[PDB]
Amino acid sequence: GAASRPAILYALLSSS
Amino acid sequence: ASIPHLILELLKCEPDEPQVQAKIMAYLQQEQANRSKHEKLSTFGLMCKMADQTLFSIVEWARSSIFFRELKVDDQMKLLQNCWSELLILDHIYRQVVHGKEGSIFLVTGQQVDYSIIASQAGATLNNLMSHAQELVAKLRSLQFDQREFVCLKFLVLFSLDVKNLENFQLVEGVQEQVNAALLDYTMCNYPQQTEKFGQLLLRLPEIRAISMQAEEYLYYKHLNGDVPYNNLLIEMLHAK
Numbered sequence: 001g002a003a004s005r006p007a008i009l010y011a012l013l014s015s016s
Numbered sequence: 017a018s019i020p021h022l023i024l025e026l027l028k029c030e031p032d033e034p035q036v037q038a039k040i041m042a043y044l045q046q047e048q049a050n051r052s053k054h055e056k057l058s059t060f061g062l063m064c065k066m067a068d069q070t071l072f073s074i075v076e077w078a079r080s081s082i083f084f085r086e087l088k089v090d091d092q093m094k095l096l097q098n099c100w101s102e103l104l105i106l107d108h109i110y111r112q113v114v115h116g117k118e119g120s121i122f123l124v125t126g127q128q129v130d131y132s133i134i135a136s137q138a139g140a141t142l143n144n145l146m147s148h149a150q151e152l153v154a155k156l157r158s159l160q161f162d163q164r165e166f167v168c169l170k171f172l173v174l175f176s177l178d179v180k181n182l183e184n185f186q187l188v189e190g191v192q193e194q195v196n197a198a199l200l201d202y203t204m205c206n207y208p209q210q211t212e213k214f215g216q217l218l219l220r221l222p223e224i225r226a227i228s229m230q231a232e233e234y235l236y237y238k239h240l241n242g243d244v245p246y247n248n249l250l251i252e253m254l255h256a257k
């Protein structure tokens with residue numbers, strides 16, 4: 001779920 | 017080299033390799049300097065943070081790349097969750113081809129380690145991983161694998177037809193079709209004497225997948241023994257499934 005989503009990856013991809 | 021224009025587009029986000037090597041080496045030196053004489057990271061922990069930093073550099077590569085940068089974040093996540101370890105393997109083998117020498121491993125930091133050191137100090141699981149990687153490097157050296165082909169392979173790894181539930185699957189089909197075509201054009205024009213180069217390159221892709229899986233398995237047991245440092249990208253990818 002959201003628990004297994006890699007937080008650092010998501011943060012990197014979310015940045016503009 | 018005559019180069020298909022598509023491959024020129026792909027090449028535009030390549031890093032200055034020796035600069036990145038030096039930046040990573042400087043990072044690891046700063047990590048160790050931040051640490052007291054007695055709290056220094058282990059070799060294994062340092063090697064994990066080196067792979068971590070490499071992965072950051074890979075993510076920066078993908079996020080800025082043509083095509084990939086037009087996907088929604090949740091598609092980007094799905095692609096990278098599928099291929100992260102294949103891309104770290106591919107990065108590694110290409111580095112061995114262009115910077116490395118037979119007999120030693122060339123690390124992303126620019127340091128070299130004799131395989132005989134590794135054979136005498138590492139366990140069977142790591143040794144077998146190193147053996148399989150060496151076989152792959154031998155093949156790619158033999159083929160005179162170059163940067164143009166490397167960037168095509170990265171794109172074919174990244175835009176994987178194995179990935180379910182994408183919002184823009186059509187772009188994956190397009191990358192597969194058009195990058196295969198550009199790669200074949202490239203090999204046929206630039207290595208005509210190797211009549212099967214395109215197909216021999218492509219035969220390495222399932223081998224990279226296999227190695228990547230064996231690597232994940234190795235890191236997974238090392239994690240079970242508490243040995244993989246956490247708070248980083250590497251360990252998160254490993255746990256994402």
Ligand SMILES: C/C=C/CC/C=C/CC/C=C/CCCCCCC(=O)OC[C@H](COP(=O)(O)OCCN)OC(=O)CCCCCCC/C=C/C/C=C/CCC
Nearest residue numbers: 059060063064067101104105108134137138139142149231
């Ligand atoms: C996911 C794929 C990422 C690929 C990126 C490329 C990474 C380069 C691999 C580097 C190996 C360096 C070893 C140099 C240390 C010299 C002494 C030695 O052999 O270490 C033994 C130690 C204990 O032996 P041990 O056998 O663990 O210990 C048993 C006895 N204690 O060995 C280590 O410190 C291991 C370092 C490897 C950790 C890197 C993190 C990512 C892991 C990838 C798995 C390796 C893939 C290689 C395929 C190319």
